[PDB]
Amino acid sequence: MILQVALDLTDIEQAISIAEKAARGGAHWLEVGTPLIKKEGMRAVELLKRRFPDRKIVADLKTMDTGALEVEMAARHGADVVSILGVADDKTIKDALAVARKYGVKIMVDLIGVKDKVQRAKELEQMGVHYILVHTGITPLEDLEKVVKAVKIPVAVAGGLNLETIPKVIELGATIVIVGSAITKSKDPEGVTRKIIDLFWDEYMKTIRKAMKDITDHINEVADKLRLDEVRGLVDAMIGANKIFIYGAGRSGLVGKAFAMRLMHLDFNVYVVGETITPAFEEGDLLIAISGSGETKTIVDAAEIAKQQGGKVVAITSYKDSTLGRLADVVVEIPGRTAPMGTLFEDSTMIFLDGIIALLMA
Amino acid sequence: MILQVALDLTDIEQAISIAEKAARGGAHWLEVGTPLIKKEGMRAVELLKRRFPDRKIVADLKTMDTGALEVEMAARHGADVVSILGVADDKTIKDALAVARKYGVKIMVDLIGVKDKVQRAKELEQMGVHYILVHTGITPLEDLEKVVKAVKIPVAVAGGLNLETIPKVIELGATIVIVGSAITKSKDPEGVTRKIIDLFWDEYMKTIRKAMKDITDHINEVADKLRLDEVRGLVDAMIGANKIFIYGAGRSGLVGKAFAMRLMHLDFNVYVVGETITPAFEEGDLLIAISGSGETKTIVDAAEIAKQQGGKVVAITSYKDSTLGRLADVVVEIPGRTAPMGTLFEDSTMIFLDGIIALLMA
Amino acid sequence: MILQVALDLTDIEQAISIAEKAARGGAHWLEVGTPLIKKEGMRAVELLKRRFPDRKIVADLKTMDTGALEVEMAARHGADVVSILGVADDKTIKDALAVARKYGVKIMVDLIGVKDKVQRAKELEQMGVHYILVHTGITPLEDLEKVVKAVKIPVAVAGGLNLETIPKVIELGATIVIVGSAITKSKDPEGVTRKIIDLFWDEYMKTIRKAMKDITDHINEVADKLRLDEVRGLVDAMIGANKIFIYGAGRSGLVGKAFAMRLMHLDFNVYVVGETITPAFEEGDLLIAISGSGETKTIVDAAEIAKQQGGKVVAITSYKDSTLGRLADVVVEIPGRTAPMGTLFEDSTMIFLDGIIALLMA
Amino acid sequence: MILQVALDLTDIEQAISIAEKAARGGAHWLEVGTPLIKKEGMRAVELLKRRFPDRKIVADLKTMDTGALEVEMAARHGADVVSILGVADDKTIKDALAVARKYGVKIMVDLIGVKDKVQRAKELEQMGVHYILVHTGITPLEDLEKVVKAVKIPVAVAGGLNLETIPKVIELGATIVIVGSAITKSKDPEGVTRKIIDLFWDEYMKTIRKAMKDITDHINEVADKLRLDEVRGLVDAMIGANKIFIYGAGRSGLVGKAFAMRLMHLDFNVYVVGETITPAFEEGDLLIAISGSGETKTIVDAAEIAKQQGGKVVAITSYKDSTLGRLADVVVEIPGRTAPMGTLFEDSTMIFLDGIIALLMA
Ligand SMILES: [Mg+2]
Ligand SMILES: [Mg+2]
Ligand SMILES: [Mg+2]
Ligand SMILES: [Mg+2]
């Protein structure tokens, strides 16, 4: 999550004083508001940037005089993010988008005066808008529901956000939380900032726990759906083999090595393809080929050589009808679908092969 | 599990003809019964051995005239296992055990006439007896209960074992299943042998599924008991570091590499200790040290260098107060308590670090 | 080289007593002579074998009454090598060879009565005879010259071999040195055996020194014939690259890693293909591909990806016109022509890349 | 080598026109002369820098009004190197040195008016002067002799340098070659620059060839000085070992793996410490420990474990009396002294172990 501190004050010294305490509290972004860009020049964003190079500075240009030139004036003064309005012409948005690409600067677009905010949000994602800014309305939070469920890019929210209302906007999927007077008008703006970051870590702990249990739920399904042909086909091939070669691609290769390390303890004549001591593949040897897609070129080339040498091939893959699957004598189908398809495949194979070891040890 | 075919026939030519069909069905051991060692000589054991060199031949010498001379004659004729009685004197048991030790031959001892079957099995385990043979009694299976719960060595069972009664003795923990007339006196002895092996694989499928869910249940516990101080300490150290070095011992090292591969995709300046491209540890770098015991010498030595260079150390360990834990600035405790202590730590850390990656990608 | 002790004594108890002292001195083979296989039976070969299982026992059957029956009796009594005559019929030679093949036993054939010793040895090599035995003649050693220069299999020598005449037969290429009374009829047969082994190591020291200088002489030739276009092409590509990827096959890969370790110390953005931390190949990156043949499939496949990504490829190979060479933008040709073709390329490249490092450090 | 183009013209447009052609010819450094820094301001170095960011710009401040302030004025305008006089006060030199450290800028010091140029050069190296500038005098080149042989930092030379005199100053060890009118007053300044760089590559080819032969000369000395105790001690230990473990540190570890790969082809039971399949070190195993210094902590710890397990240790080291040497049963002393001591040790071990392989193959 990202905490953006809106410095809506007209006092330049009061604004920098607040940002310094908020920065110690853990705030990520600092917004130079429109009341600060009219009195002070564009150097207002440069004063904040040269003082806080570790933070991203957001230039609030949510006024109608803003064109592609004012957006470039922000980037040259050190603005990392520039905010504009959605009611502006599409021509000015793409012109601001091209200027942003020349400087590596993000673009935020507000929907404060948009009739159909939902429809407008989708086309903004098409041109390359980085963030969408919506307001809470403190039917409050109704807008945050639909715009978030409509687009994939991060959505920023603002409007009466305090330690009381911030947990709500997080539950609805807001990425950027813009808070103003709740920090700027407090006795300890740094202390209030830490409580907001503590709320962020309440969500982070839920994310990691949910990520862990989402993987373990998938692995329980793999275990419940294992077939006798697959398990026995692998075990009988391992026992009847002269040498055992294991070959996996990328992270699958680390899983293969972790399995080989255990097989060595059971006095199997096992080797890892690609390491120093790997001997020549001969007749009667077994190749355990691990590839989630079943199309990895190096894994397929190794399986083809093993068949030509008069050996057996066991393919661990998610696609039994893949090129690797059609070569194998035994196909162990591990499904791959929080976590990507590859991560589920690698971790499921990891614990499946540990189940294989437990079986051999009994 | 082990399938032992009892050849109680007195015809030697019929015994080898039937043993050949049972061997094709997947039988592991072949027993030359006492009615075969009295009509035929000790050459009955040598004829079976030279015919089935890949099979283990069991010489049934379960009579009371058996001494060290008859036991030594079996090993010299090619018997891999010799079965004797438990009611014999302890002197003859160690004399048969010492004779067996001279040939690398196992010794099976039956408890058919033992008063207290539980006690006798345990003291047999003390002298070094390899296997204990008990009978079903077809209160049937009561003995199989207590002998299994009393010793750690494999327990052999025999007595009215067919396709209906074999599943029960497997459920009670018998390792060696001795089947006679159910195979030897059947119209298709090879088909019955395959069906008995199919019964073995019904238990194997239960073992591997139970092995997998035992690991995932422990990881769910790890997720529920993760601490915010530890998780945030690791993440904040990772974000605030110049270079990130990851170093694990053995199988833990493969887990560390799997985490490093993902961190590289997230544009971290990450390296794996021990690989070719690893640069020098400087001030502001972070060492993530992974060691279940927290006492691995190489991992501890790397943590000491990292501290002397003015760097941070995060220890992922099962022992927070270990030598590695006491050096670390942040300790991520992966709790402990079918699978060994090392396997649970490695698999829990693997899925925990995948939860960390899921958090960083949000 | 092999030291064979001829036990031509008729006393069996004296033969084993002397063979025990020769074995402690380091003798490899023990020959039970014909005067021992006629007075004593074929059990002379079994008594020696069960006494020296780590030694190879040679059964001297060099008489003309020897047929397939006597040769088979030696293998069944534990003879590892059987010596017969070259003047026998070819039918009995292949019959002894086929009998030997059934036991995994070698066959030695003497040429004591052969008309044309050169021709007979070569046709013996065609049938699969393992060793050729010739006699010194103490024009002595003339036969040892021609038989050695005629066949590829080891040549055994015998005839007046003591500490003065053994160095000469070694210089002429004899592999098996058969010594009799110089050991068996001496005051210290164990000491004489150690002195004969010391003679073997005088030749070994010459072999290893000659092996090393053969490699360094080839590398001096590589240095003298290096081309400015190749060397500068590699250096200029290295300096002008964003990332440098190094990829070698097998032992060439270890050489590539050794070069990568040094380049990292020179502040190059260098990575090794196949290791954990290797990132994605982008535009402006360089692939240094090392392959002696220029046909290694994985190396060729990596060069093709590097070209499709808009990168440069430098191929270090022995074949400029190979598949890898034709893909490369720069080809560094490491020339070819005791050491195999692979060893010369790997060691020449290793020292060439160390010359490159010395240049860069200046 | 470095080619520095002195732009001594007073015309700013003529100076930038010359530097653009010289840059295409391969010139490394561009010097903004004093006749350019008096007419134009310090922006003269900024105009060259913003036009040639790929080149290092040298600010010629060899006048007496130069203090620490003028040196800082050059760095803020983009000067990568600043040149001053040696006849200035030592106070101004260290003040310029401290300013250079704040900006990462090099300092060049001329000896045009120094009485004893040799003596003055040494103390300049003590304070941290990066380069020493001397003049040819076209007894010309006499100054270049003594100043180069007195200091270790790079020495820059200037004065009548043309395609005729440049080969001479290179032979005397000049690092930076400053050429003016020979390029600036030619019909093709880019073409003349390429001929100077071609002269540089005539020296580079000599450097790499000399580096290669310096290594091979050292290896021939190692071969000539090998001892029977070392070679036989290693070979007898390898043959009499159950398992063979190889463990080297850093680049020595790659040499160890290259040797292990060859030993595997000879059917040795050989393993590499640190890889996946490495089994447990048991009684009767051999550890080949490779460490140039004989003090590498991980190598010493592995040798100590091997001795406690009842195994043998062979140490390949340059220091027989090191900690590793005192542990070993056999010490193979490889000397380590163009190339560092480690490079000579690693490459000598590399070809020695290839001599060992050739010996075993005979
Ligand atoms: Mg705002
Ligand atoms: Mg029975
Ligand atoms: Mg002879
Ligand atoms: Mg000058």
PDB file of C-alpha atoms in Angstrom, chain D residues 18-181:
ATOM      1  CA  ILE D  18      38.308  18.483 -33.762  1.00  0.00           C
ATOM      2  CA  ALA D  19      37.061  16.583 -30.712  1.00  0.00           C
ATOM      3  CA  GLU D  20      34.109  15.176 -32.660  1.00  0.00           C
ATOM      4  CA  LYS D  21      36.360  13.644 -35.316  1.00  0.00           C
ATOM      5  CA  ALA D  22      38.895  12.453 -32.746  1.00  0.00           C
ATOM      6  CA  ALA D  23      36.103  10.803 -30.753  1.00  0.00           C
ATOM      7  CA  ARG D  24      35.100   8.760 -33.807  1.00  0.00           C
ATOM      8  CA  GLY D  25      38.765   7.805 -34.224  1.00  0.00           C
ATOM      9  CA  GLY D  26      38.854   6.280 -30.739  1.00  0.00           C
ATOM     10  CA  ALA D  27      40.277   9.051 -28.545  1.00  0.00           C
ATOM     11  CA  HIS D  28      39.557   8.553 -24.844  1.00  0.00           C
ATOM     12  CA  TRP D  29      40.167  11.931 -23.197  1.00  0.00           C
ATOM     13  CA  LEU D  30      39.547  15.483 -24.398  1.00  0.00           C
ATOM     14  CA  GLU D  31      41.565  18.313 -22.850  1.00  0.00           C
ATOM     15  CA  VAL D  32      40.182  21.850 -22.722  1.00  0.00           C
ATOM     16  CA  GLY D  33      43.401  23.853 -22.826  1.00  0.00           C
ATOM     17  CA  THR D  34      44.285  27.010 -20.944  1.00  0.00           C
ATOM     18  CA  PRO D  35      43.875  29.178 -24.099  1.00  0.00           C
ATOM     19  CA  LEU D  36      40.245  28.009 -24.056  1.00  0.00           C
ATOM     20  CA  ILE D  37      39.560  28.575 -20.328  1.00  0.00           C
ATOM     21  CA  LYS D  38      40.614  32.251 -20.370  1.00  0.00           C
ATOM     22  CA  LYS D  39      38.477  33.435 -23.290  1.00  0.00           C
ATOM     23  CA  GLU D  40      35.511  31.174 -22.619  1.00  0.00           C
ATOM     24  CA  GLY D  41      34.433  30.595 -19.041  1.00  0.00           C
ATOM     25  CA  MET D  42      34.363  27.335 -17.147  1.00  0.00           C
ATOM     26  CA  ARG D  43      31.404  26.448 -19.384  1.00  0.00           C
ATOM     27  CA  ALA D  44      33.970  25.490 -22.039  1.00  0.00           C
ATOM     28  CA  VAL D  45      34.414  22.225 -20.159  1.00  0.00           C
ATOM     29  CA  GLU D  46      30.633  21.953 -19.771  1.00  0.00           C
ATOM     30  CA  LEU D  47      30.038  22.358 -23.511  1.00  0.00           C
ATOM     31  CA  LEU D  48      32.487  19.535 -24.224  1.00  0.00           C
ATOM     32  CA  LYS D  49      31.026  17.364 -21.469  1.00  0.00           C
ATOM     33  CA  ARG D  50      27.377  17.685 -22.466  1.00  0.00           C
ATOM     34  CA  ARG D  51      28.456  16.962 -26.050  1.00  0.00           C
ATOM     35  CA  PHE D  52      30.745  14.028 -25.129  1.00  0.00           C
ATOM     36  CA  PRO D  53      29.346  12.322 -22.008  1.00  0.00           C
ATOM     37  CA  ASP D  54      31.010   9.102 -23.155  1.00  0.00           C
ATOM     38  CA  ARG D  55      34.465  10.716 -22.898  1.00  0.00           C
ATOM     39  CA  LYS D  56      36.449  12.013 -19.938  1.00  0.00           C
ATOM     40  CA  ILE D  57      37.091  15.763 -20.122  1.00  0.00           C
ATOM     41  CA  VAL D  58      40.390  17.101 -18.754  1.00  0.00           C
ATOM     42  CA  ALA D  59      40.363  20.687 -17.464  1.00  0.00           C
ATOM     43  CA  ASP D  60      43.753  22.329 -18.076  1.00  0.00           C
ATOM     44  CA  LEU D  61      44.272  24.605 -15.060  1.00  0.00           C
ATOM     45  CA  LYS D  62      48.077  24.765 -15.273  1.00  0.00           C
ATOM     46  CA  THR D  63      48.343  28.405 -14.230  1.00  0.00           C
ATOM     47  CA  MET D  64      49.365  30.050 -10.972  1.00  0.00           C
ATOM     48  CA  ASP D  65      46.027  31.705 -10.107  1.00  0.00           C
ATOM     49  CA  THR D  66      44.579  28.220  -9.577  1.00  0.00           C
ATOM     50  CA  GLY D  67      43.430  27.358  -6.075  1.00  0.00           C
ATOM     51  CA  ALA D  68      41.042  24.859  -4.513  1.00  0.00           C
ATOM     52  CA  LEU D  69      38.115  26.968  -5.741  1.00  0.00           C
ATOM     53  CA  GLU D  70      39.030  26.774  -9.438  1.00  0.00           C
ATOM     54  CA  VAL D  71      39.384  22.987  -9.160  1.00  0.00           C
ATOM     55  CA  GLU D  72      35.882  22.749  -7.698  1.00  0.00           C
ATOM     56  CA  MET D  73      34.594  25.047 -10.452  1.00  0.00           C
ATOM     57  CA  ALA D  74      35.857  22.516 -13.003  1.00  0.00           C
ATOM     58  CA  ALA D  75      34.181  19.541 -11.314  1.00  0.00           C
ATOM     59  CA  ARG D  76      30.817  21.301 -11.105  1.00  0.00           C
ATOM     60  CA  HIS D  77      31.042  22.037 -14.844  1.00  0.00           C
ATOM     61  CA  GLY D  78      31.720  18.392 -15.705  1.00  0.00           C
ATOM     62  CA  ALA D  79      35.502  18.000 -15.653  1.00  0.00           C
ATOM     63  CA  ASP D  80      36.464  14.386 -15.007  1.00  0.00           C
ATOM     64  CA  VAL D  81      40.181  15.203 -14.683  1.00  0.00           C
ATOM     65  CA  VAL D  82      41.829  18.424 -13.488  1.00  0.00           C
ATOM     66  CA  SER D  83      45.474  19.267 -14.265  1.00  0.00           C
ATOM     67  CA  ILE D  84      47.584  21.501 -12.001  1.00  0.00           C
ATOM     68  CA  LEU D  85      51.258  22.378 -11.513  1.00  0.00           C
ATOM     69  CA  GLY D  86      53.786  20.707  -9.240  1.00  0.00           C
ATOM     70  CA  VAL D  87      55.528  23.988  -8.415  1.00  0.00           C
ATOM     71  CA  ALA D  88      52.431  25.042  -6.466  1.00  0.00           C
ATOM     72  CA  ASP D  89      52.234  24.881  -2.689  1.00  0.00           C
ATOM     73  CA  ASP D  90      51.571  21.511  -1.093  1.00  0.00           C
ATOM     74  CA  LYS D  91      48.651  23.160   0.719  1.00  0.00           C
ATOM     75  CA  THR D  92      46.893  23.877  -2.579  1.00  0.00           C
ATOM     76  CA  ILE D  93      47.477  20.314  -3.795  1.00  0.00           C
ATOM     77  CA  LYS D  94      45.852  18.636  -0.794  1.00  0.00           C
ATOM     78  CA  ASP D  95      43.043  21.205  -0.903  1.00  0.00           C
ATOM     79  CA  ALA D  96      42.518  20.252  -4.546  1.00  0.00           C
ATOM     80  CA  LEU D  97      42.762  16.588  -3.529  1.00  0.00           C
ATOM     81  CA  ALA D  98      39.996  16.943  -0.935  1.00  0.00           C
ATOM     82  CA  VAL D  99      37.773  18.757  -3.441  1.00  0.00           C
ATOM     83  CA  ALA D 100      38.435  15.958  -5.930  1.00  0.00           C
ATOM     84  CA  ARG D 101      37.365  13.355  -3.377  1.00  0.00           C
ATOM     85  CA  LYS D 102      34.038  15.142  -2.821  1.00  0.00           C
ATOM     86  CA  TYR D 103      33.267  14.854  -6.559  1.00  0.00           C
ATOM     87  CA  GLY D 104      35.079  11.680  -7.654  1.00  0.00           C
ATOM     88  CA  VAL D 105      37.430  13.623  -9.936  1.00  0.00           C
ATOM     89  CA  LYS D 106      41.017  12.748 -10.806  1.00  0.00           C
ATOM     90  CA  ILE D 107      43.989  15.067 -10.279  1.00  0.00           C
ATOM     91  CA  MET D 108      46.901  15.445 -12.708  1.00  0.00           C
ATOM     92  CA  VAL D 109      50.082  17.266 -11.667  1.00  0.00           C
ATOM     93  CA  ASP D 110      52.685  18.619 -14.098  1.00  0.00           C
ATOM     94  CA  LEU D 111      56.439  18.831 -13.436  1.00  0.00           C
ATOM     95  CA  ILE D 112      57.266  21.477 -16.047  1.00  0.00           C
ATOM     96  CA  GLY D 113      59.200  23.725 -13.666  1.00  0.00           C
ATOM     97  CA  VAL D 114      60.272  21.286 -10.959  1.00  0.00           C
ATOM     98  CA  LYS D 115      63.995  21.180 -10.125  1.00  0.00           C
ATOM     99  CA  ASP D 116      64.231  17.515  -9.072  1.00  0.00           C
ATOM    100  CA  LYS D 117      61.277  15.955 -10.884  1.00  0.00           C
ATOM    101  CA  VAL D 118      62.132  12.454  -9.642  1.00  0.00           C
ATOM    102  CA  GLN D 119      62.070  13.295  -5.928  1.00  0.00           C
ATOM    103  CA  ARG D 120      58.936  15.446  -6.261  1.00  0.00           C
ATOM    104  CA  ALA D 121      56.989  12.612  -7.930  1.00  0.00           C
ATOM    105  CA  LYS D 122      57.215  10.197  -4.965  1.00  0.00           C
ATOM    106  CA  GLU D 123      55.679  12.547  -2.391  1.00  0.00           C
ATOM    107  CA  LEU D 124      52.874  13.378  -4.825  1.00  0.00           C
ATOM    108  CA  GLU D 125      51.898   9.693  -4.799  1.00  0.00           C
ATOM    109  CA  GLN D 126      51.741   9.817  -0.990  1.00  0.00           C
ATOM    110  CA  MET D 127      49.031  12.494  -0.817  1.00  0.00           C
ATOM    111  CA  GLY D 128      46.921  10.645  -3.390  1.00  0.00           C
ATOM    112  CA  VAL D 129      47.706  12.310  -6.724  1.00  0.00           C
ATOM    113  CA  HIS D 130      46.193  10.166  -9.463  1.00  0.00           C
ATOM    114  CA  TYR D 131      48.412  11.014 -12.467  1.00  0.00           C
ATOM    115  CA  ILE D 132      51.818  12.600 -13.075  1.00  0.00           C
ATOM    116  CA  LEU D 133      52.342  14.755 -16.176  1.00  0.00           C
ATOM    117  CA  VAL D 134      55.831  15.041 -17.688  1.00  0.00           C
ATOM    118  CA  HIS D 135      57.104  16.499 -20.947  1.00  0.00           C
ATOM    119  CA  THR D 136      59.144  14.739 -23.619  1.00  0.00           C
ATOM    120  CA  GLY D 137      61.532  17.598 -24.374  1.00  0.00           C
ATOM    121  CA  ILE D 138      61.377  17.211 -28.159  1.00  0.00           C
ATOM    122  CA  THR D 139      68.093  14.555 -23.695  1.00  0.00           C
ATOM    123  CA  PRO D 140      64.506  13.862 -24.813  1.00  0.00           C
ATOM    124  CA  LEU D 141      62.609  11.089 -22.993  1.00  0.00           C
ATOM    125  CA  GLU D 142      65.196  11.104 -20.177  1.00  0.00           C
ATOM    126  CA  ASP D 143      62.612  12.553 -17.787  1.00  0.00           C
ATOM    127  CA  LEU D 144      60.117   9.843 -18.741  1.00  0.00           C
ATOM    128  CA  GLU D 145      62.673   7.193 -17.739  1.00  0.00           C
ATOM    129  CA  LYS D 146      63.205   8.198 -14.106  1.00  0.00           C
ATOM    130  CA  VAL D 147      59.725   9.412 -13.112  1.00  0.00           C
ATOM    131  CA  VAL D 148      58.126   6.207 -14.405  1.00  0.00           C
ATOM    132  CA  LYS D 149      60.664   3.984 -12.639  1.00  0.00           C
ATOM    133  CA  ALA D 150      60.079   5.932  -9.403  1.00  0.00           C
ATOM    134  CA  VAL D 151      56.289   5.926  -8.956  1.00  0.00           C
ATOM    135  CA  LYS D 152      53.479   3.390  -9.315  1.00  0.00           C
ATOM    136  CA  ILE D 153      50.551   5.620 -10.399  1.00  0.00           C
ATOM    137  CA  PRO D 154      50.012   6.242 -14.143  1.00  0.00           C
ATOM    138  CA  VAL D 155      52.327   8.772 -15.781  1.00  0.00           C
ATOM    139  CA  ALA D 156      51.094  11.058 -18.557  1.00  0.00           C
ATOM    140  CA  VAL D 157      53.509  12.322 -21.211  1.00  0.00           C
ATOM    141  CA  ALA D 158      53.275  15.143 -23.781  1.00  0.00           C
ATOM    142  CA  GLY D 159      55.516  17.047 -26.221  1.00  0.00           C
ATOM    143  CA  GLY D 160      55.846  16.558 -29.992  1.00  0.00           C
ATOM    144  CA  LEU D 161      54.052  13.196 -30.022  1.00  0.00           C
ATOM    145  CA  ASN D 162      53.407  11.943 -33.587  1.00  0.00           C
ATOM    146  CA  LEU D 163      53.127   8.579 -35.308  1.00  0.00           C
ATOM    147  CA  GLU D 164      56.953   8.760 -35.226  1.00  0.00           C
ATOM    148  CA  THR D 165      57.556   9.426 -31.513  1.00  0.00           C
ATOM    149  CA  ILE D 166      54.516   7.739 -29.910  1.00  0.00           C
ATOM    150  CA  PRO D 167      55.966   4.184 -30.113  1.00  0.00           C
ATOM    151  CA  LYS D 168      58.936   5.412 -28.066  1.00  0.00           C
ATOM    152  CA  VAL D 169      57.010   6.838 -25.098  1.00  0.00           C
ATOM    153  CA  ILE D 170      54.946   3.636 -24.944  1.00  0.00           C
ATOM    154  CA  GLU D 171      58.106   1.526 -24.619  1.00  0.00           C
ATOM    155  CA  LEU D 172      59.147   3.583 -21.570  1.00  0.00           C
ATOM    156  CA  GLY D 173      55.901   2.895 -19.699  1.00  0.00           C
ATOM    157  CA  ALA D 174      53.795   5.994 -20.338  1.00  0.00           C
ATOM    158  CA  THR D 175      50.108   5.378 -19.640  1.00  0.00           C
ATOM    159  CA  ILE D 176      48.476   8.575 -20.926  1.00  0.00           C
ATOM    160  CA  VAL D 177      49.622   9.907 -24.307  1.00  0.00           C
ATOM    161  CA  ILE D 178      48.736  13.578 -24.878  1.00  0.00           C
ATOM    162  CA  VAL D 179      48.887  14.548 -28.555  1.00  0.00           C
ATOM    163  CA  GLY D 180      47.970  17.955 -29.969  1.00  0.00           C
ATOM    164  CA  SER D 181      49.016  19.378 -33.331  1.00  0.00           C
TER     165      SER D 181
END
